[PDB]
Amino acid sequence: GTIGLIWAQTRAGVIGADGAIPWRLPEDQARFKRITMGHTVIMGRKTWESLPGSVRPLPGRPNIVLTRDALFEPDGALAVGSADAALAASDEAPWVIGGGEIYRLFLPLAQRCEVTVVEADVPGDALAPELGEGWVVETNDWQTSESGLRYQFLSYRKV
Ligand SMILES: NC(=O)c1ccc[n+]([C@@H]2O[C@H](COP(=O)([O-])OP(=O)(O)OC[C@H]3O[C@@H](n4cnc5c(N)ncnc54)[C@H](OP(=O)(O)O)[C@@H]3O)[C@@H](O)[C@H]2O)c1
Numbered sequence: 039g040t041i042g043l044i045w046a047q048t049r050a051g052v053i054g055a056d057g058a059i060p061w062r063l064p065e066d067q068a069r070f071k072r073i074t075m076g077h078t079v080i081m082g083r084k085t086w087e088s089l090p091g092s093v094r095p096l097p098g099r100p101n102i103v104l105t106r107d108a109l110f111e112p113d114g115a116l117a118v119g120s121a122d123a124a125l126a127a128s129d130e131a132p133w134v135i136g137g138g139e140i141y142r143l144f145l146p147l148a149q150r151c152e153v154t155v156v157e158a159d160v161p162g163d164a165l166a167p168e169l170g171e172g173w174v175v176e177t178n179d180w181q182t183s184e185s186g187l188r189y190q191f192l193s194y195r196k197v
Pocket residue numbers: 044045046047052053054055056057058059081082083084085086088104105106107110118119120121135136137138139140141143164
Protein backbone atom coordinates (compact mmCIF):
# COMPACT_ATOMS: atom_id res chain seq x y z
CA GLY A 39 0.00 0.00 0.00
CA THR A 40 1.10 3.52 -0.97
CA ILE A 41 -0.65 6.48 0.65
CA GLY A 42 -0.24 9.82 -1.09
CA LEU A 43 -1.21 13.35 -0.07
CA ILE A 44 -2.02 16.01 -2.67
CA TRP A 45 -2.73 19.66 -1.93
CA ALA A 46 -2.30 23.22 -3.18
CA GLN A 47 -1.15 25.95 -0.79
CA THR A 48 -0.05 29.53 -0.79
CA ARG A 49 3.60 30.07 0.07
CA ALA A 50 2.53 30.76 3.67
CA GLY A 51 0.63 27.45 3.94
CA VAL A 52 -2.99 28.53 3.40
CA ILE A 53 -5.18 25.92 1.70
CA GLY A 54 -8.73 27.15 2.33
CA ALA A 55 -10.86 30.06 3.48
CA ASP A 56 -14.57 30.05 4.35
CA GLY A 57 -15.01 26.51 3.05
CA ALA A 58 -13.38 27.06 -0.35
CA ILE A 59 -10.01 27.34 -2.09
CA PRO A 60 -9.26 31.08 -2.40
CA TRP A 61 -7.77 31.05 -5.91
CA ARG A 62 -8.30 29.69 -9.42
CA LEU A 63 -5.52 27.60 -10.98
CA PRO A 64 -6.67 25.50 -13.96
CA GLU A 65 -3.26 23.91 -14.46
CA ASP A 66 -3.52 22.60 -10.89
CA GLN A 67 -7.03 21.22 -11.41
CA ALA A 68 -5.83 19.37 -14.51
CA ARG A 69 -2.79 17.99 -12.67
CA PHE A 70 -4.89 16.92 -9.66
CA LYS A 71 -7.34 15.15 -11.95
CA ARG A 72 -4.60 13.39 -13.92
CA ILE A 73 -2.76 12.25 -10.78
CA THR A 74 -5.78 10.96 -8.88
CA MET A 75 -7.84 9.50 -11.76
CA GLY A 76 -8.62 5.82 -11.22
CA HIS A 77 -7.40 5.93 -7.59
CA THR A 78 -9.34 5.99 -4.34
CA VAL A 79 -9.61 9.58 -3.05
CA ILE A 80 -9.99 10.21 0.70
CA MET A 81 -11.43 13.48 1.98
CA GLY A 82 -12.97 15.12 5.02
CA ARG A 83 -16.69 15.88 5.16
CA LYS A 84 -16.08 19.60 4.78
CA THR A 85 -14.05 18.96 1.62
CA TRP A 86 -16.82 16.78 0.18
CA GLU A 87 -19.17 19.71 0.82
CA SER A 88 -16.78 22.17 -0.78
CA LEU A 89 -16.87 20.21 -4.04
CA PRO A 90 -18.89 21.85 -6.83
CA GLY A 91 -21.96 19.70 -7.31
CA SER A 92 -21.01 18.93 -10.91
CA VAL A 93 -17.89 17.10 -9.67
CA ARG A 94 -19.37 15.66 -6.47
CA PRO A 95 -18.47 12.79 -6.39
CA LEU A 96 -15.20 13.25 -8.23
CA PRO A 97 -15.78 11.22 -11.41
CA GLY A 98 -13.73 8.14 -12.27
CA ARG A 99 -12.42 7.74 -8.70
CA PRO A 100 -13.94 5.96 -5.69
CA ASN A 101 -14.80 8.76 -3.27
CA ILE A 102 -14.32 8.11 0.48
CA VAL A 103 -15.45 10.73 3.03
CA LEU A 104 -14.47 10.82 6.71
CA THR A 105 -17.22 11.89 9.13
CA ARG A 106 -18.12 11.11 12.72
CA ASP A 107 -21.74 10.62 11.67
CA ALA A 108 -22.07 6.87 11.05
CA LEU A 109 -25.24 7.72 9.03
CA PHE A 110 -23.83 10.49 6.77
CA GLU A 111 -24.94 9.66 3.22
CA PRO A 112 -22.80 11.09 0.38
CA ASP A 113 -24.57 9.80 -2.73
CA GLY A 114 -22.04 8.12 -4.98
CA ALA A 115 -19.40 7.97 -2.22
CA LEU A 116 -18.57 5.91 0.87
CA ALA A 117 -18.81 7.50 4.32
CA VAL A 118 -16.40 6.13 6.95
CA GLY A 119 -15.70 7.03 10.56
CA SER A 120 -11.93 6.54 10.96
CA ALA A 121 -8.59 6.57 9.17
CA ASP A 122 -8.31 2.79 9.62
CA ALA A 123 -11.73 2.30 8.03
CA ALA A 124 -10.86 4.57 5.10
CA LEU A 125 -7.67 2.65 4.35
CA ALA A 126 -9.44 -0.70 4.77
CA ALA A 127 -11.85 0.47 2.04
CA SER A 128 -9.11 1.90 -0.19
CA ASP A 129 -7.36 0.47 -3.21
CA GLU A 130 -3.56 -0.03 -3.25
CA ALA A 131 -2.74 3.65 -3.95
CA PRO A 132 -5.21 6.09 -2.36
CA TRP A 133 -4.76 9.86 -2.50
CA VAL A 134 -5.69 11.97 0.50
CA ILE A 135 -7.21 15.10 -1.04
CA GLY A 136 -8.00 17.28 1.99
CA GLY A 137 -8.81 19.18 3.85
CA GLY A 138 -6.72 20.54 6.70
CA GLU A 139 -7.96 18.10 9.33
CA ILE A 140 -7.72 15.09 7.04
CA TYR A 141 -4.20 15.92 5.76
CA ARG A 142 -2.88 16.02 9.33
CA LEU A 143 -4.60 12.71 10.09
CA PHE A 144 -2.93 10.78 7.23
CA LEU A 145 0.49 12.51 7.00
CA PRO A 146 2.22 10.03 9.40
CA LEU A 147 1.17 7.19 7.04
CA ALA A 148 2.02 8.95 3.78
CA GLN A 149 4.84 8.05 1.40
CA ARG A 150 4.55 11.02 -0.96
CA CYS A 151 3.08 14.51 -1.01
CA GLU A 152 2.21 16.20 -4.29
CA VAL A 153 2.19 19.89 -3.49
CA THR A 154 1.27 22.88 -5.59
CA VAL A 155 2.65 26.14 -4.21
CA VAL A 156 0.90 29.28 -5.43
CA GLU A 157 2.14 32.88 -5.22
CA ALA A 158 -0.85 34.41 -3.47
CA ASP A 159 -0.83 36.53 -0.30
CA VAL A 160 -4.37 35.51 0.64
CA PRO A 161 -5.56 34.66 4.18
CA GLY A 162 -7.49 31.58 5.20
CA ASP A 163 -8.68 29.45 8.08
CA ALA A 164 -7.32 26.08 6.87
CA LEU A 165 -3.61 25.29 6.58
CA ALA A 166 -1.44 22.70 4.85
CA PRO A 167 0.28 20.13 7.08
CA GLU A 168 3.80 20.91 8.20
CA LEU A 169 6.48 18.74 6.60
CA GLY A 170 9.32 18.16 9.04
CA GLU A 171 12.28 15.84 8.83
CA GLY A 172 11.99 12.74 6.65
CA TRP A 173 11.15 14.19 3.21
CA VAL A 174 13.23 14.98 0.12
CA VAL A 175 12.09 17.16 -2.80
CA GLU A 176 13.55 18.51 -6.05
CA THR A 177 12.63 22.06 -6.92
CA ASN A 178 10.91 22.98 -10.18
CA ASP A 179 10.73 26.25 -12.08
CA TRP A 180 7.87 28.55 -11.16
CA GLN A 181 5.20 28.71 -13.84
CA THR A 182 2.71 31.34 -14.98
CA SER A 183 -0.88 30.24 -15.43
CA GLU A 184 -3.25 31.51 -18.09
CA SER A 185 -5.13 32.88 -15.06
CA GLY A 186 -1.95 34.90 -14.35
CA LEU A 187 -1.18 33.33 -10.99
CA ARG A 188 2.34 31.95 -10.62
CA TYR A 189 2.63 28.42 -9.29
CA GLN A 190 5.10 25.63 -8.57
CA PHE A 191 4.70 21.84 -8.39
CA LEU A 192 6.70 19.93 -5.77
CA SER A 193 6.90 16.15 -5.36
CA TYR A 194 7.95 15.25 -1.82
CA ARG A 195 9.04 11.68 -1.15
CA LYS A 196 9.87 9.95 2.12
CA VAL A 197 13.60 9.42 2.63
N1 LIG B 1 -5.85 23.67 -1.26
C1 LIG B 1 -6.18 22.40 -1.39
O1 LIG B 1 -5.52 21.59 -2.07
C2 LIG B 1 -7.40 21.92 -0.66
C3 LIG B 1 -7.91 20.64 -0.87
C4 LIG B 1 -9.08 20.25 -0.25
C5 LIG B 1 -9.73 21.13 0.59
N2 LIG B 1 -9.22 22.36 0.78
C6 LIG B 1 -9.94 23.39 1.68
O2 LIG B 1 -9.82 22.98 3.01
C7 LIG B 1 -11.01 23.37 3.74
C8 LIG B 1 -11.56 22.16 4.45
O3 LIG B 1 -10.56 21.70 5.39
P1 LIG B 1 -11.03 21.42 6.87
O4 LIG B 1 -9.94 20.95 7.76
O5 LIG B 1 -11.83 22.60 7.28
O6 LIG B 1 -12.04 20.20 6.65
P2 LIG B 1 -11.84 18.67 6.24
O7 LIG B 1 -10.58 18.12 6.78
O8 LIG B 1 -12.02 18.58 4.71
O9 LIG B 1 -13.07 17.92 6.94
C9 LIG B 1 -13.13 17.93 8.37
C10 LIG B 1 -14.21 16.97 8.78
O10 LIG B 1 -13.77 15.61 8.57
C11 LIG B 1 -14.31 14.79 9.58
N3 LIG B 1 -13.23 14.26 10.40
C12 LIG B 1 -12.12 14.91 10.85
N4 LIG B 1 -11.33 14.17 11.60
C13 LIG B 1 -11.97 12.94 11.63
C14 LIG B 1 -11.65 11.72 12.24
N5 LIG B 1 -10.54 11.51 12.95
N6 LIG B 1 -12.50 10.68 12.07
C15 LIG B 1 -13.60 10.87 11.33
N7 LIG B 1 -14.00 11.97 10.70
C16 LIG B 1 -13.14 12.98 10.89
C17 LIG B 1 -15.29 15.67 10.35
O11 LIG B 1 -16.56 15.69 9.67
P3 LIG B 1 -17.98 15.85 10.48
O12 LIG B 1 -18.14 17.30 10.88
O13 LIG B 1 -19.00 15.39 9.47
O14 LIG B 1 -17.83 14.85 11.69
C18 LIG B 1 -14.62 17.04 10.25
O15 LIG B 1 -15.51 18.13 10.44
C19 LIG B 1 -11.94 24.04 2.73
O16 LIG B 1 -11.84 25.46 2.80
C20 LIG B 1 -11.44 23.50 1.40
O17 LIG B 1 -11.69 24.38 0.30
C21 LIG B 1 -8.09 22.77 0.19
